[PDB]
Amino acid sequence: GSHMMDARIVNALIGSVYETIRDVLGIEPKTGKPSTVSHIEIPHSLVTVIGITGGIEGSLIYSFSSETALKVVSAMMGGMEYNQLDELALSAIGELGNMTAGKLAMKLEHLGKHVDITPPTVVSGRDLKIKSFGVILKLPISVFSEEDFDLHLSVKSGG
Amino acid sequence: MMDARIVNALIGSVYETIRDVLGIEPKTGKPSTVSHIEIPHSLVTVIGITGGIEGSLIYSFSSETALKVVSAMMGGMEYNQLDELALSAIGELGNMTAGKLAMKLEHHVDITPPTVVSGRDLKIKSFGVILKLPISVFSEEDFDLHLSVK
């Protein structure tokens, strides 16, 4: 049962964000200031969940608008036009999360924390609310536009 | 799907949680291998699995079924809105299911803390072969259990 979340974990998260959206999207992101939040407040219609076990128990969750997603997917495909979030689109979105989570695990297994990453599960919908357990950390991220990316790290334990 | 003994404890965790928590006997309908997930629901609970098997245990239901669910857990009282107490209860249903999934799986896999997502017209994307399993608790197939794997 975590009540706090180690700085090394935050810095490994932040590091994984740059390396990831850079290599997968071709864009150097502008991470925000990390902060602990009472719960997850999603304004967006898209949300991706990646479970984490072992070293740390919790998840990694990111979300954005339908608009931002189309850019993301279009960027992930060399910049080619994409106007409908179909199966292929939603898989690209999930993969972005998988990569970020993949880099995080990688960096983490050097600080002593060994973790397993569950495959992503993408959820699109309207008045989305999300219940996460453990200490919730928020990381505002700017990819294309100012704070167009929400990244939340749920830490039930391992902190 | 694969190792049938994996499946049995996976479906058995949801069944047993519904029985102990909601206090009623569900009719776990006939399994099926679907291409994706056609969710006509407002509440979804995701429980990730790592180690041996990789994927997630996901069960979902409508806003109407959700109220009924909350009523069962709340001393059999009456519940008319999907407020925070309702979401906290469904979040609890998740932790029980997760709790049972762990307890029942001691004979090399790890369980992820559950995540409860709620909203309107929830379209869900899962990674891996999916095993759909309808479940009757309060109405005919008001519960739908989805199992995605490697």
**Rounded CA separation A61/A132 (Å):** 9
Separation in Å, CA of A109 to nearest CA in chain B:
16
- In this complex, do A128 and B121 lie within 8 Å of one another by their Cβ atoms? no
**B116, B123, B127 member nearest A131 (Cβ):** B116
CB B144 within 8 A of CB B134: yes
- In this complex, do A134 and B113 lie within 8 Å of one another by their Cβ atoms? yes
**Rounded CA separation B72/B26 (Å):** 13
Which domain does A79 fall in, by range?
1-159
User: Could you tell me how many helices (H) and strands (E) chain A has, helices first?
Assistant: 3, 9
CB B56 within 8 A of CB A53: no
CB A61 within 8 A of CB A101: no
> Which residues of B lie inside 8 Å of A (Cβ-Cβ)?
36, 44, 46-51, 54-56, 58, 87-88, 90-91, 94-95, 110-128, 148
Q: In total, how many domains does chain B have?
A: 1
Q: Which of A39, A41, A131 should we substitute to test contact with B (largest number of B Cβ atoms within 10 Å)?
A: A131
A131 three-state secondary structure: strand
Residue identified by tokens 């299911």 is B97
**Rounded CA separation B6/B18 (Å):** 19
Both tokens of residue A81? 């036009």
Q: Which residue intervals of B22-130 are DSSP H helices?
A: 63-73, 84-103
Q: Could you write out the DSSP letters of every residue in A50-91?
A: EEEEETSEEEEEEEE-HHHHHHHHHHHTTT----S--HHHHH
Residue of B nearest to A128 (CA): B119
Residue identified by tokens 């990819």 is A143
| C-alpha triplet A45, A63, A150: angle, nearest 5° | 130
**Rounded CA separation B35/B114 (Å):** 24
What is the resolution in angstroms?
Answer: 2.5
What is the 3-state composition of chain A as percent helix, strand, coil, each rounded to the nearest 5? Answer: 35, 30, 35
Residue A127: CATH number of its domain? 3.40.1550.10
Separation in Å, CA of A16 to nearest CA in chain B:
21
